[PDB]
Structure 1
Amino acid sequence: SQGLLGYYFSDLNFQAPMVVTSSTTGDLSIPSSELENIPSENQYFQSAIWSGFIKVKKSDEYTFATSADNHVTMWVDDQEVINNKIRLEKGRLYQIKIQYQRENPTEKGLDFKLYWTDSQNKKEVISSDNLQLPELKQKSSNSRKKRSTSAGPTVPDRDNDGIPDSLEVEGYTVDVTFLSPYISNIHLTKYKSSPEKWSTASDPYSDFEKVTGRIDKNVSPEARHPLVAAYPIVHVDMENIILSKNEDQSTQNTDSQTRTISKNTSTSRTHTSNSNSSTVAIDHSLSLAGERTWAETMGLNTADTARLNANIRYVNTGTAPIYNVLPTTSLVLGKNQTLATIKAKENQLSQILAPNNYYPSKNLAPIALNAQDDFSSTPITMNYNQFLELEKTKQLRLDTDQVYGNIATYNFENGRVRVDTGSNWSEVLPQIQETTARIIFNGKDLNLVERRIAAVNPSDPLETTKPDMTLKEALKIAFGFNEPNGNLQYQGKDITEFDFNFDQQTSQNIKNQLAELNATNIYTVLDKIKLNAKMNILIRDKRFHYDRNNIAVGADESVVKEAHREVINSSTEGLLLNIDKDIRKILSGYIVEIEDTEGLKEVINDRYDMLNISSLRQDGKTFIDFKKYNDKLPLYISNPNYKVNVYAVTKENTIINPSENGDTSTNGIKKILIFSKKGYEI
């Protein structure tokens, strides 16, 4: 992605840029054959400017020449060499500026080459190994000045990202790599960006770096748009836990039987601020014999303590990767009882933590909080009262900071992306947060995904130089909504299948906009609602009920019923159905009941911890197993007029402890009838 940077103009005076691109060698030509996305009238180039550096591998005297010296002025550093021998020294970098003007060319495109001749009189087009791009960064480097010589033309590029002011403001496209003005009736993505922000989203990648692919390949595709922020978002996923009674100096004997408690866990990133937090649910379903308390199970007295181990992974749901610092996490019981601080070793990561991925990767083992080969893992200890609290709440919280370490950035000297020790996420995130609107959307699998989109702040003059951002456009560019036939959709689902919720400031702002639009319904004017910096917008699938963490925990009876209508097979052994994956996510289990002729009901799996009777098969269909908690026996129906009733239990209606009186039965559980057939119908 290296060479000289070229601006090719339709007018004579460097005002109407048609193509911005880079060469590889001194051949700076663009044939008309490559100009499909330029209309023919504007393929006539009357002026051009090139910029970059020349690197010398042999100290010598050199003569520069082009294909059109009578139309050219060229500077090496501040020195005009065309408008002649110049001594250049090995190991040194010289700035190049070339301008070309030719009125009324008769051919489209441009045939243009840059040559040099050494002392041996050998003339050649300059090799790619001798040419570098300009330093299109916010600061110069030790060897590479960020501005070109003042002599000659200065194409307006107030932020030094390489994209001319006029294209950033008026609209541009990139084609396979030609950057050109966007023209409705020919074109491809329409980009606009701020001509005064090197990164319009205030992230660490320039607007030009994003649209030309001069960027970390791990940056999410949507964040190659100059108006979508590229930044990591990390939380911790806990997969399972094991609780152990701590040994004490008094117990000399360590030969005792296994008395640990092992449970699966389910973790979700939450939204209730710019914090990273996830909430863990400890499974309440049957795992051990008896119906003992956890203390009875593990042999804990009131003066004993217990410890927890667990398997975890880190999850990046953001748009940029992390390389050398994983964030620190606090493991919290109840509201504010910190049980552990979880850290990884800085500068010793075994892999990248990339967007839409895990650390460790899912094809590798997870991390154990107390690793078998770590002598120095701190025991995560609870006192007896804390242990009882965990038994009752079956909940933990993982609060993760935003300490993400160093950033891999592009270097124009060599075209490489490398971790830059001088660039840190902690210097970048505050400004992303301050200048963007935040949308949290759960249409991908019901988990909360945050994106930030550049948006004007009317009260910050710099931020008013950014383009207007509508709500519709933000959903398209940040989340991949599309609009086939007028209607805005996400993966086939109309936008009207999702609700809108806002913070208090954002809500008043939107309400005022709708009033100025005399619009009674936001869904019909999404192209006219403008976002502003610091808005917070939460968009959720309407089929579901949500808890205080905005985790999906249930759904209307009508929705759940309809989701279970399509029965494939029924028998005394169970039911086989096709159920939407999203529905399965909000269920904790099923209750199976036999109803006799007088209306009395026998619940088969009549325990709060015996509802986990469904499984997903390879075919993707669900089996509800009547036998599992019926002693591996099918249901015995003593009269064909008896009914088999099956009920679904949503998570919000799930009982996770015996009742106050000790009753472990299902009496009182709010449950949704989803199947009811007589024996002769089975």
Structure 2
Amino acid sequence: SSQGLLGYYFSDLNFQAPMVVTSSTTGDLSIPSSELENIPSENQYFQSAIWSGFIKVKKSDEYTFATSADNHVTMWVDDQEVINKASNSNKIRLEKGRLYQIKIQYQRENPTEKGLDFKLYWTDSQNKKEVISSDNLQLPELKQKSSNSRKKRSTSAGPTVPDRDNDGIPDSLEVEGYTVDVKNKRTFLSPWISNIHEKKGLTKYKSSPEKWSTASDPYSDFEKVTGRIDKNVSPEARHPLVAAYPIVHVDMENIILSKNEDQSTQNTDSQTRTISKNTSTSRTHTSEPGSNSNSSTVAIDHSLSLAGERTWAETMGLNTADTARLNANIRYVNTGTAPIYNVLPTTSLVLGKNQTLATIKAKENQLSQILAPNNYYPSKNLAPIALNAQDDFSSTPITMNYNQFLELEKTKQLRLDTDQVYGNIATYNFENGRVRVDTGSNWSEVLPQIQETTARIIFNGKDLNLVERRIAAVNPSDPLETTKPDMTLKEALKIAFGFNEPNGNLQYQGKDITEFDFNFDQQTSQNIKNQLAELNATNIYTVLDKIKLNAKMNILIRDKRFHYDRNNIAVGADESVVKEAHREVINSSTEGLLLNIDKDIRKILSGYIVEIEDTEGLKEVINDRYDMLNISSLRQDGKTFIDFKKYNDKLPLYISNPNYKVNVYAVTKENTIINPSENGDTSTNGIKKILIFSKKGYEIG
């Protein structure tokens, strides 16, 4: 179906203006004029063509080859001419289960019909003639190396379409620009033509004629654009300028802490004394100069989970000589553009700066599913992985000594550092036209080259989570990399992240590019500054189509509404933004508030404080504890309810005088208190909070 001979159809007589490149499943190599909608009528006249591939016979015999235009054809089988501008009955012996190279050239001056009607036949020893069937034809070996049975180069006899990197796309098309259009059953690759293709919304591709994969990834420029590729590769990475590669971090969903048994305590029948908390995990990115790493940071919930206000040690019965253990539920997350099949990366679980508590490994070659881009392992419809699994005798306890435990209690943070060891790659095989995991292909042989030859953009426009993409970009000092097309900042955002420009303004899902800020590493910053100066431009947002990306740039693009920590996690927002986000109140009562709040805003709030203010200006704080601020919840209808009763002994607010005010304040993550004060105070005293609702009793109804 994606198999057969590869054909190049030229408008000129001498094989130099390719109009269509496409495959044929059978010996019918025709292109009817009805299929040439994307070619100018005048270029629909084909004066030459070349086909290449292999023939595999099902039975040894003597065959004679013929075409529908023998006077215009020369054909080679494994370097030997079988047709030479004349019909013949010259038989050739072909052996079953052997592969023979095929090259066919056709030339005809001034055709009177558009397209091409052309069939390749053979006749066996019994004198039966037919168009060669699909089971007998295979594509050329369009790879960087030959296989044992299939040479990557066609015979030096006759014409060679210039294809320096052997990906299948002619040099000239890669440089000048090409488009791909899907006929009913075939993909046609043709030159870009402004006045035809622009209006139709077709993508203009350019790629390096000297790089088999312009992004230095494991899929060729041709494989990508013709769909001869792992179906799990992300849509954006089907562009030859966007790198296809996995990017993995670990998400921790919840944690349970408990005291380790010890030989001195023979008693094992005591009551449960564990601490269980939800956790929130974010993939991070830091200013570390040379970084190319995977890491995530875990925030352990500090909100009320059990009676009293005990220390963790008191809760768990931990004395100073005891040790504690952690278990957790996790998933792997692939935010990259290619899947993983047989090796999950190894992860260190780290306390503080550099105290490793655990090394998390999965068994190689025993994955229960693929880890696909924009997805999880295990999938979300399945249970997560427990670090110490119930079925597993050999899971290492994740232990902390007393001092480490106290440090975890104080910081309520862990870090997960994940390596970039991703295993084998599923590649396309031209012999059988299928994608399979290839034992000879490994991500570790690809990643360094991807990292060296691309510009990196990290963007948080999807739910404020950091998503990295890499785009092929020129390196002015590496000659091979100068053969790549110019990559602009505007184009990179379109092809890598799906920005569009419906009305003269670049947008991501309705939000203008000006709603996002640009952050650069030191070298990228100097580069971009220099470019702006050379453009006489004072504002980057008006010249995104003129800013050129270079290999090894690092660009970070973040939603401007938010405040960010050093990990580039969103942790707050300006008071004006938070106030406006809460302005639309659906209902209010002594039981709480019902509001429509934007999902991104909700992400940066740790909770709310409710207070009644009397006429003299004194305030009664209702939920007056740092661990009692979790009073918001998202309803199924998408609305947020702020629950006044939850920490008011299950009672609606009592407003003794209608002139009293009910005030509700939002507390952002960056302002959240996560421990009692040094003096032991557990109240909300001093917490930096943002007034988001204030109404008198008679206004609440």
Q: Report TM bin, short chain.
A: over 0.9
State the match for 1:182 in structure 2: 192
Question: What is the CA deviation profile of residues 194-225 of structure 1, one whole-angstrom value per residue up to 9, with x for unaligned ones?
Answer: 00000000000000000000000000000000
Rounded Cα–Cα distance in structure 2 between residues aligned with 1:537 and 1:578 = 33
Q: Deviations over 1:534-573 (max 9, x none)?
A: 0000000000000000000000000000000000000000
Q: Work out the CA distance in 2 between the residues paired with 1:282 and 1:398.
A: 13
Task: Give the secondary-structure state (helix, strand or coil) at the position aligned to 1:33.
Answer: helix
Deviation readout 1:502-528 (Å, 9 max, x if unpaired):
000000000000000000000000000
- What are the Cα deviations for residues 480-504 of structure 1, in whole angstroms up to 9, with x where unaligned? 0000010000000000000000000
Instruction: Please say if 1:251 is aligned against 2:265.
Output: yes
Indicate the SS of the match to 2:299.
strand
Return the alpha-carbon distance in structure 1 between the equivalents of residues 635 and 617 of structure 2.
34
The C-alpha deviation readout for 1:150-198, integer Å capped at 9, x for no partner, is 0000000000000000000000000010000010110100000000000
Q: Distance in 1 between matches of 2:138 and 2:515?
A: 51
CA distance in 2, matches of 1:286, 1:58: 77
**CA shift digits 1:583-611 (9 cap, x unpaired):** 00000000000000100000000000000
1:632 and 1:128 map into 2 onto residues whose CA distance is 74
Other structure's SS at 1:553 match: strand
* CA–CA separation in structure 1 for the residues paired with 2:225 and 2:11: 22
1:123 maps onto 2:129 in alignment: yes
Q: In the aligned structure 2, how far is the partner of 1:570 from the partner of 1:366?
A: 38
Equivalent in the alignment of 2:154: 148
Following TM superposition, by how much is the alpha carbon of 1:336 offset from its aligned partner in structure 2, in angstroms? 0.1
Q: 2:230 aligns with which of 211, 216, 230?
A: 216
Aligned partner of residue 168 in structure 1, secondary structure: helix
Alignment of 1:288-307 (within 5 A): 288-307=306-325
Hey, what's the Cα distance between the residues in 2 that align with 1:39 and 1:632?
A: 75
Give, in angstroms, the shift of residue 634 of structure 1: 0.2
Q: Hey, what's the Cα distance between the residues in 1 that align with 2:494 and 2:405?
A: 47
Deviations 1:455-480 (A, max 9, x none): 00000000000000000000000000
1:428 pairs with 2:438: no
What TM-score, normalized to structure 2?
A: 0.97
What's the CA shift for 1:91?
1.1
Distance 2:281 2:221 in 1: 36
What do the CA deviations read for 1:426-468 (whole angstroms, capped 9, x no partner)? 0000000000000000000000000000000000000000000
Q: How far apart are residue 622 of structure 1 and its match?
A: 0.2
CA distance, structure 2, for counterparts of residue 597 and residue 9 of structure 1? 88
Deviations, residues 38-62 of structure 1 (Å, cap 9, x unaligned)? 0100000000000000001111000
Report SS of the residue matched to 2:440: strand
Q: What's the TM-score once normalised by structure 1's chain length? A: 1.00
CA distance in 1 between partners of 2:96 and 2:415 (Å): 60
Deviation at 1:328, TM superposition (A): 0.1
Output one character per residue of 1:404-440: Cα deviation in whole Å (capped at 9) or x when no partner: 0000000000001000000000000000000000000
Tell me, what secondary structure is at the counterpart of 1:410?
strand
Name the SS for the 2:194 alignment partner. coil
Cα drift, residue 31 of structure 1: 0.2
Aligned counterpart, 2:74: 73
Which whole-Å CA distance do the structure 1 matches of 2:237 and 2:4 have between them? Answer: 25
Listed as ranges, the matches of 1:340-379 within 5 Å are 340-379=358-397
- Residue 667 of structure 2 corresponds to 649
Match of 1:440, SS state, is strand
Return the alpha-carbon distance in structure 2 between the equivalents of residues 520 and 661 of structure 1: 52
Distance apart, 1:84 and its partner CA: 1.5
CA distance in structure 2 between the aligned counterparts of 1:538 and 1:572, rounded to whole angstroms: 45
SS of 2:196 mapped into structure 1: coil
Shift of 1:101: 0.2
Alpha-carbon distance between aligned partners in 1 of 2:38 and 2:335, rounded to the nearest angstrom: 35
Aligned twin of 2:646: 628
Rounded Cα–Cα distance in structure 1 between residues aligned with 2:578 and 2:328: 33
Deviations 1:234-270 (A, max 9, x none): 0000000000100000101000000000000000000
Q: CA deviation at 1:103?
A: 0.1
Unaligned runs of 5+ in 1: none
2:168 to 159, 162, 172: 162
Distance 2:189 2:90 in 1: 34
1:274 deviates by 0.9
- Aligned partners of 1:184, 1:576: CA distance in 2, in Å? 53
The CA deviation string for residues 26-81 of structure 1, in whole angstroms up to 9 with x for no partner, is: 00000000000001000000000000000011110000000000000000001000
Output one character per residue of 1:637-666: Cα deviation in whole Å (capped at 9) or x when no partner. 000000000000000000000000000000
Distance, in Å, in 2 between the alignment partners of 1:615 and 1:263 is: 17
CA distance in 2, matches of 1:571, 1:285: 25
C-alpha distance in 1 between matches for 2:161 and 2:303: 68
Give the whole-Å Cα distance in 1 for the aligned partners of 2:448 and 2:359: 24
In 1, the alpha carbon distance for the partners of 2:351 and 2:60 equals 69
Q: State how far apart, in whole Å, the 2-side matches of 1:575 and 1:554 are.
A: 22
For the residue of structure 2 that corresponds to 1:29, the secondary structure is coil
Report how far residue 126 of structure 1 moved.
0.1
SS of 1:185 mapped into structure 2: helix
Measure the CA separation in 2 of the matches of 1:362 and 1:265: 17
What SS does the aligned partner of 1:186 have?
Answer: helix
Aligned with 2:51: secondary structure? Answer: strand
Query: Is the partner of 1:321 in helix, strand or coil?
Result: coil
How far apart, in 1, do the equivalents of 2:258 and 2:527 lie?
A: 53
Q: Deviation per CA, 1:63-109, whole angstroms, max 9, x where unpaired?
A: 00000000000000010000921111111000000000000000000
Q: Percent identity?
A: 100
Q: Distance in 1 between matches of 2:560 and 2:330?
A: 31
List per-residue Cα deviations over 1:361-381 (Å, max 9, x = no partner): 000000000000100000000
| SS of the residue 1:202 aligns to | coil
Q: Which of 201, 219, 227 is 2:241 aligned to? A: 227
4+ long deviations beyond 4 Å:
none
- CA distance, structure 2, for counterparts of residue 174 and residue 20 of structure 1: 9
Distance in 2, matches of 1:556 and 1:76, equals 73
| 1:198 equivalent in structure 2 | 212
Map residues 515-594 of structure 1 onto 2, 5 A cutoff: 515-594=533-612
Tell me the distance in 1 between the aligned counterparts of 2:260 and 2:149: 61
What is the distance in 2 between the residues matched to 1:139 and 1:484? 43
Alignment counterpart, residue 411 of structure 1, candidates 429, 451, 457:
429
* 1:4-25 CA-partner distances (Å, limit 9, x unpaired): 0000000000000000000000
- Give the Cα separation in 1 of the matches to 2:285 and 2:680: 34
Q: How far, CA to CA, are the matches of 2:374 and 2:503 in structure 1?
A: 30
SS at match of 2:602: helix
Structure 2 distance, partners of 1:198, 1:97, is 22
Structure 2: 5+ residue stretches without partners? 84-88
Q: When the two structures are aligned, how many residues end up with a matched partner?
A: 682
CA distance in 1, matches of 2:221, 2:362: 33
Aligned partners of 1:162, 1:344: CA distance in 2, in Å? Answer: 38
TM-superposition CA deviations, 1:247-303 (whole Å, max 9, x none): 000101000000000000000000001100000000000001000000000000000
The secondary structure found in structure 1 opposite 2:392 is: coil
C-alpha distance in structure 1 between counterparts of 2:41 and 2:465, whole Å: 49
